[PDB]
Design a protein around this ligand. Structure first.
Ligand code: MG
Ligand code: MG
Ligand code: MG
Ligand code: ZN
Lengths: 190, 196, 52, 153, 205
RNA sequence: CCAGAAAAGGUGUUGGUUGAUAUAGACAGCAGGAUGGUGGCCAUGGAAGUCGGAAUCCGCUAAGGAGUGUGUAACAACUCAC
């Protein structure tokens, strides 16, 4: 069948400010401003409540493969609200057996040179996609903190360095080396 | 089967409220079946302690309430892993014996820590071949008198930590477990009265 | 030689996967059928033989 | 400094396979004068599987037998023991009766890890079909004893 | 050296059996047709599941035996050694012919006997398994594993008949209490109201 | 006609049959127990529920199988049924 109506509301906290230019959303809060263009997804986005309390997305007459897009908009919007109010912090740790991985941060968070991975001399330069910052943390030996607003940029810049530190042409079940994502989370705890 | 199990649990909670008009509504949070069986086998001639589904007990109370109009003050106090204990002997002697039947149970690898586990600096009675279980913790040791000498203490886990697997087997080797979980009783029901 | 929680951190990205019997695709541990339409999203998986 | 240890020995024969030494050695005491004295202290057990606690001081251990219910019922199920030959399948047949089951249930309440005697006779009659003999019939015949025709204290 | 069954798969010829005219036929691959404890009464296995065919095709004797062993292995694993009765309800009678070349060609083309092949109709029962009423899933699973030894499309049908009888399973025990049916092993005997009544009084004695 | 395809599959999606269990509060999910006779008997070199052959019940129970798996020389440790 086609369901006649499927809707979900998203509660919008008091410190943050979402608004609509048609189908795209913009979010203004303490840490910054983050927009996203939903023009591929064919829904209705009402901004209801005065003092702007709820974002209600509803889809009329949908098959299940397009009713699946109803609450994924809610997930992207509330992930956006989390990234603007609180921000995102991916702490990914370096794991090695014999040779230590030397991570040196260049141009204040934007480039990561990874050295001595499996002893080899090839330097791995991975660039953070624009808006996230990598940093070697204190109170942990070999850790990389990726801070940003939006999870696609944060986790994608993390996945770039995790796909960079890869062991090829050898047994990946014995050679457990590389930097791996350890602790997903939040810059400012609520 | 399940339907007759539900229906005779109803009857064995009708009868045990009809004959005992004095109860402690007891929270059986994270105690073991071993410990509850040994307490229940100790306290048989004095009391009967009983457990079950809270949404079944509250409907049993709402099946009593047209006959016994005193039981509905129990209804806001039935949530959490919380059962009953019924007795006719006295009022606080069984409070004191539930506080005295506490047993310190083992630290499971994955339980959260209530309170303050440390180990004394001492020569154990383990032996030479069991030092790799100290090396996983990185505790600096010495061997003397044929067994392992702990040089200085270590507060290995804080108030409120996760108990790990390497940190769980070593305490089971040393036969020390400070985690004491017993019955942590919440309210008292005695003839339509509430005591803390 | 390696810290054990870091070792199991590497094992959650390199070891406890599923592999499809056909196509040999690498799948998440809570898998039921394969991701690829290469093999027809087929249903027979194996738990990725571990290291001895 | 009084210590408690357990050993699972095999009764009356002197055990050639030494398992006493890896526990009695690290505190220093002689294990081979302990193991044979345990065997003669058992004596009449002589063919069965027996756990024994040892209260060992800094000076001397004391020998006393831990009871075990499947051994206590099979020591009453008295058939002539098979020797060194150790052939096929010593499946137990014969008819034990209820009164020695009562006085073994006394030993099951000696250390009080059970409910009372009406429950101990049930949980030890379960051990009878664990072993393989019958009290003139099986526990499908001997549930209706404790149902309304009990011979229990 | 045996040809694939896609050659000898359709009911192409008139039925040509082992007889006074076709001599020298090699014996059939299958020769055992009942399995399990076939010495069982009608009373102790009520349930009966049929592998019923659904295309007018030709099944070979080797395929019959392969599916037989496939069901037998699974039910001696599952329902125990002595707790069912498998019956194969197709005996192979149509024999099949083979023209071998060694250069004569198609001159004098008439085949030597090669094998035996069962001819099956729309809705004919190929295998039937009689067991107790709680071993229903094991009947379904055993016949589903035995389907893959045959060509074509076969389906599974648990009958309303009491076991290997022609009588309905609900009224069976009523009729055996009312004594129109007499147990005589894996089958049952039907007693009409038409004999001399010395037989009636010998039953009612 | 006729110019090319099968057995087998799919948690793509759409209909249809049949049977379950669920406000006595289910299916996910996150958390807490998962115990005594007992390390049951044969058996094995060692088989403590976890290689094997038959058994496969009671106590206490809200509940726990003489055990679904990971394991262990074998226990320990984990996990599941419940
Ligand atoms: Mg190689
Ligand atoms: Mg060919
Ligand atoms: Mg022809
Ligand atoms: Zn696949």
């Amino acid at each position: 069948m086609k369901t006649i109506l499927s809707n979900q509301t998203v509660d919008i906290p008091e410190n943050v400010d979402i608004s609509l230019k048609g189908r795209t959303v913009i979010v203004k809060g303490p840490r910054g401003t983050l927009r996203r263009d939903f023009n591929h997804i064919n829904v209705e986005l009402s901004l209801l409540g005065k003092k702007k309390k709820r974002l209600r997305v509803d889809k009329w007459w949908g098959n299940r493969k397009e009713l699946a897009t109803v609450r994924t908009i809610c997930s992207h919007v509330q992930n956006m609200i989390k990234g603007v109010t609180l921000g995102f912090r991916y702490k990914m740790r370096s794991v090695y057996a014999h040779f230590p991985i030397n991570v040196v941060i260049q141009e204040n968070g934007s480039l990561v040179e990874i050295r001595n991975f499996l002893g080899e001399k090839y330097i791995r330069r991975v660039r953070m996609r624009p808006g996230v910052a990598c940093s070697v943390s204190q109170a942990q030996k070999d850790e990389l903190v990726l801070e940003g607003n939006d999870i696609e940029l944060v986790s994608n810049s993390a996945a770039l360095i995790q796909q960079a530190t890869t062991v090829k042409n050898k047994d990946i079940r014995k050679f457990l080396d590389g930097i791996y994502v350890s602790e997903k989370g939040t810059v400012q705890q609520a | 089967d399940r339907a007759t199990w539900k229906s005779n649990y109803f009857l064995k909670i009708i009868q045990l409220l009809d004959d005992y008009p004095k109860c402690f509504i007891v929270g059986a949070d994270n105690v073991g079946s071993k410990q509850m069986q040994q307490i229940r086998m100790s306290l048989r001639g004095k009391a009967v302690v009983l457990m079950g589904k809270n949404t079944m007990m509250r409907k049993a109370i709402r099946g009593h309430l047209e006959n016994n109009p005193a039981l509905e003050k129990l209804l806001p106090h039935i949530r959490g892993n919380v059962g009953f204990v019924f007795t006719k002997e006295d009022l606080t002697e069984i409070r004191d014996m539930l506080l005295a039947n506490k047993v310190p149970a083992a630290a499971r690898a994955g339980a959260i820590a209530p309170c303050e586990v440390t180990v004394p600096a001492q020569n154990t009675g383990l032996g030479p071949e069991k030092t790799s279980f100290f090396q996983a913790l990185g505790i600096t040791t010495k061997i003397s008198r044929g067994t392992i000498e702990i040089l200085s203490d270590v507060q290995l886990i804080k108030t409120g930590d996760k108990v790990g697997a390497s940190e769980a087997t070593l305490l089971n080797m040393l036969n020390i477990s400070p985690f004491s979980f017993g019955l942590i009783i919440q309210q008292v029901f005695d003839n339509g009265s509430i005591y803390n | 030689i390696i810290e054990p929680s870091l070792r199991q951190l590497a094992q959650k990205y390199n070891c406890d996967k599923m592999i499809c019997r056909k196509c040999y695709a690498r799948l998440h541990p809570r898998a039921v059928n394969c991701r690829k339409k290469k093999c027809g999203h087929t249903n027979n998986l194996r738990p990725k033989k571990k290291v001895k | 400094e009084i210590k408690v240890v357990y050993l699972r020995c095999t009764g009356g024969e002197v055990g050639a396979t030494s398992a006493l030494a890896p526990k009695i050695g690290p505190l220093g005491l002689s294990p081979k004068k302990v193991g044979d004295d345990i065997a003669k202290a058992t004596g009449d057990w002589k063919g069965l599987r027996i756990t024994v606690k040892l209260t060992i001081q800094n000076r001397q251990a004391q020998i006393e037998v831990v009871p075990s219910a499947s051994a206590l019922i099979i020591k009453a199920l008295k058939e002539p023991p098979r020797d060194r030959k150790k052939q096929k399948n010593i499946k137990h047949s014969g008819n034990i009766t209820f009164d020695e089951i009562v006085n073994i249930a006394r030993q099951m309440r000696h250390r009080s890890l059970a409910r009372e005697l009406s429950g101990t006779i049930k949980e030890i009659l379960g051990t009878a079909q664990s072993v393989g003999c019958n009290v003139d019939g099986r526990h499908p015949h001997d549930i209706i004893d404790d149902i309304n025709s009990g011979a229990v204290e | 050296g045996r040809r694939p069954a896609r050659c000898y798969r359709y009911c192409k010829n008139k039925p040509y059996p082992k007889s006074r005219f076709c001599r020298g036929v090699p014996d059939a691959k299958i020769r055992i047709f009942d399995l399990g404890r076939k010495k069982a009464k009608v009373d102790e296995f009520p349930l009966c599941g049929h592998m019923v065919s659904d295309e007018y095709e030709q099944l070979s004797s080797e395929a019959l035996e392969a599916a037989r062993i496939c069901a037998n292995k699974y039910m001696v694993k599952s329902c125990g050694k002595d707790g069912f009765h498998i019956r194969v309800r197709l005996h192979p009678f149509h024999v099949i012919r083979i023209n071998k070349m060694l250069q004569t060609g198609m001159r004098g083309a008439f085949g030597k006997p090669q094998g035996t092949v069962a001819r099956v109709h729309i809705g004919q029962v190929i295998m039937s398994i009689r067991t107790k009423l709680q071993n229903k899933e094991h009947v379904v699973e055993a016949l589903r594993r035995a389907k893959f030894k045959f060509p074509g499309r076969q389906k599974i049908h648990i009958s309303k008949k009491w076991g290997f009888t022609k009588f309905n399973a609900d009224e069976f025990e009523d009729m055996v209490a009312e004594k129109r049916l007499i147990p005589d092993g894996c089958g049952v005997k039907y007693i009409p109201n038409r004999g001399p009544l010395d037989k009636w009084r010998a039953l009612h004695s």
